[PDB]
């Protein structure tokens, strides 16, 4: 179950990746 | 075109605990990662179910952890500490340090007691759960009707007990004590029920380490945030 | 990207009855169930539906419940209460003190008559509603041309009447009395058809127990909230 | 989460004839049927298509409902009413009465004549609608050369005329005179083509009912409010 | 055509019930 | 019938569960 | 249930060339139909692509329409109009009056000049645009040597011309004449390439007719509203 | 290509017939 | 019909970085084509991987760029410049020009050093990077330790080096020097690790050209804005 | 991905043409 506190229908606007953090993981000049 | 829209009564409220977002500032930002980093624990529960370790007082108010025992007849012994999940005991305690920033619990509690005494040694003792009803038992045997096992101190250092939830409410308070007001309850005794003996060569005298923890039966919900302390 | 609003004239207020929602605090909140108690009841309806007791007066304005009766000849008879939902009868009744916190109603009322007199005994009612038009009738006689019943005392301890829906409005004012205005309607009378008779060794006197009810027929609709009270 | 919005430039403003809803406060209220009343008229048209009755002058100014005719020649005759949906005679009437609360007209007018004479009388009369561009007729003759229908007083007792809508303009202006503009437009007159004979036993003198109504081609569009009166 | 002055392309919010007017037609104890 | 007063056709943004109150019937260390 | 909005920072502006809709007040309002109306012009280049006509100067500064000839010897001639779509010839023309209610113009201009000398005439006209980069011909040897054609009066009346857009930018300002800044350009020049000839028994001089258009190239685009006048 | 000004995706929320102007081509008493 | 909305508690802010677009004013406007324009850079990274010159000084402060060396023996060497991407080298350099404009940097770092003395010279480089942990090398010995790399002067011009990315964090912090805190990381230095040789006819003396660039390797991200200067 | 500072899930309600620059590339008298 979801997120925490964080419960509307309508979910995010923006963009994941703009509301919270991205999250990872480990032209020429010519001759 | 405008969609006409109702602008209802609150119009310009904050809410603290409101369950929906608000504007970034900062975006298309990558966070560093982790990977690497094991040890992340997801529910609090699974924290409050560690034993951590309830102090038992002597003069000087200088309590210490260990329920201590000998040669012979208690008292209306060896202790008691009653089951008030907000106790003076159990408060510092994990459970019951995360047991308060949440306002009901429900579930099965457990006590486990680990004897440090000499291996040379050989005691017994009773062990009780008593409802709140009638009163605090005066005497092991007053005791003894209410929910208990009897101890055999051997190999086996440690054992476990585990007071039940005897509640009405399917939930109980997890302690604020504007008086003592009928929902709580518990007390747990503890005596011999054969002295603590041992041989030539051994200690009279004898202390026993004190560890609460909550079961596979314990539940808190309604966060809230106690009572503003700042110690010693 | 913004939605253009045209913000309407109304935009800071409050609607007390307002058919929608508002903003959460504490969610996710999971609550004590219920489960084991048997006893609800949904609809209001299903209540002014069980008599309540018609307090019936006597010289003390000490109403009391019995409307009471004997050896002979009425009068103008045993009694005499009017149908207007609002009286001094009916109002503390369930029915009446429920049908109050309703604007309007409908349909078929019943009044209930219990005989509490010896068993030895015997008498025989005639009961009627006369609707609004020509005046309180002042003799059984006058009354009889109405909808009503010759109560035949016997086994069979009580009576069950129900004075209908005699309305050009398909409904009718639950009862507010800046005057009495047009809408209200009724009045139930009830005189002996021959005198309450009785042998040797049995009394003289004989109280019998009042109690109303909304049929299977009634309906109260409009919610609203009286007249501020407080009591003796 | 927040969808931003952009908020118009009007944003606490009250429409009066704003085509949209607002918010409720008493709902799931179930209103009082009707179901036995027949006599529903959906459309305004469908009202201002019954004569009414046009108020024909004599000094007392005690305008009364008659055009009235005698043994023989007018004059410039026996009325003369002008075509201007506003004049003295057709306001009153309905159709008049409700094209008034209404900006804009077209399509064509009635005008019946009912003849109220005696019997054994007879009589023929030329009637006509004349269009502005030239002036009043003054004369049957100058009359004639315009839409008309000589009418047989005979059996049958009323006559159907109609003035047609002859007019530049799709629409024109139901009335508000702050001066006669260029848009308004008719006269209807009427006079005898032959006297009105009698013989013997018989009144001279006769009065004929006068009705304005809205044809099978009348359309009224504009909803407006007109002028404050207060009668008489 | 449509109801009067009221022309919007949503229509309304609320609830027929709750805006205009409904508009018709003419436990136990146990023993 | 509906709820009790409460007749929007939009119902609930937010998650019932946030709105009103659910309602129900009755890692390691290692070694 | 409301749905939380973020208001943004704008919240109370009115943009006047917003593209988007506002609130009615008078609806299902039909209106008075066309039908019969030809002669509806959707785009406005499709006009100023008709000539008008640009005045050409003489002593009393009374410019008149014709570019005027004779007998022999320009001059520097016959006239010299620069194509800086703002001159002073162009002003007042659509094509100039239209291509200024707009920022920017490209494409090819087009420039006819239509004889209205005696039909026993003849004459022989060079004509030239000459783009900036040196400076403004001072002789049709100067001239030649730019985009011209040699006119041969004759049977056909008029001839046509047109400047091309020999323009590095791919559009240029409809002129705002804050100072001649490199964008604008042309001049347009014409002088006669033989004399124009007459035999016995005609006119020496005579005038010939000027009107400017904009080809099946030209383009304005940006409305803009300029310059506030109030003429003479 | 679209009206003049007036660019929203959001086209109308009245009516046609009620934000600009229609636009046109040319019971019983009983006996 | 309104829909009802809660106006959040923000309501009236303006967000600088606030990703989401805003209202127009002139719409269905055509902007002048490019077409013939190459040379377009999308991202910025593809810059700061460009050589431009790091300035190596004396005395009168007046850096100029060239390792500069001979006949023999350092010293502790020819140069020596930390990797601090803020250092004083570096600055003025687009990498550590553009890596400012931005909050954090990862990834590989590249020297290029290109020799500029005689071809009938000769010279043979020892080159390293020395990570933070004990101190700034005082001898060739003490440096070889570490990532270095023996240039051998001859034919071919440049060597290029590149310093990697010895971090304990997955990102370091751009430079700004609030005090050197336990990220920054880094000295590269250079000496000859046998002389520069020449024969008769040339020049003792020689200067070599410092250009640094960012690998195959290099991140920066968090735009950001620095540190007002105005220069000179 | 996405132009730049610029992530909402809804995009654009005016129209393109309308809020940045369209972009490009090089009746009758009769007689």
Redesign the interface.
């Given at each position: 179950?979801?997120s925490g506190?964080?419960?509307?229908?309508?979910?995010?606007?923006?963009?994941n990746?703009?509301?919270n953090?991205?999250?990872?993981?480990?032209?020429s000049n010519l001759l | 075109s405008p969609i006409p829209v109702t602008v209802r009564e609150h119009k310009g409220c904050f809410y603290s605990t409101n369950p929906d977002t608000t504007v970034p500032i900062y975006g298309k930002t990558i966070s560093t990662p982790s990977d690497y980093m094991c040890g992340e624990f997801s529910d609090l529960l699974e924290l409050c179910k560690l034993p951590t370790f309830l102090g038992n007082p002597n003069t000087n108010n200088k309590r210490y952890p260990y329920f201590s025992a000998t040669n012979s007849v208690p008292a209306t012994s060896m202790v008691d500490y009653q089951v008030a999940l907000s106790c003076s005991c159990m408060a510092n305690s994990m459970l019951a340090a995360v047991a308060r920033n949440f306002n009901q619990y429900r579930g099965s509690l457990n006590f486990l007691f680990v004897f440090t005494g000499a291996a040379m040694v050989k005691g017994k003792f009773l062990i009780a759960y008593t409802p709140p009803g009638a009163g605090k038992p005066t005497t092991r045997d007053q005791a003894m009707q209410s929910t208990y096992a009897i101890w055999d101190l051997g190999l086996n250092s440690s054992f476990n007990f585990t007071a039940p939830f005897i509640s009405p409410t399917h939930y109980r308070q997890t302690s604020y004590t504007s008086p003592t007001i009928t929902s709580v309850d518990g007390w747990v005794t503890v005596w011999q029920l054969t002295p603590l003996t041992y041989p030539s060569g051994t200690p009279t005298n004898s202390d026993i380490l004190t560890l609460v923890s909550a079961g596979d039966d314990f539940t808190l919900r309604m966060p809230i945030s106690p009572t503003k302390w700042v110690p010693q």
């Open positions: 179950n979801e506190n964080e419960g509307v229908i309508i979910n995010n606007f923006y963009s990746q703009y509301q953090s991205i999250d990872l993981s480990a032209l | -």
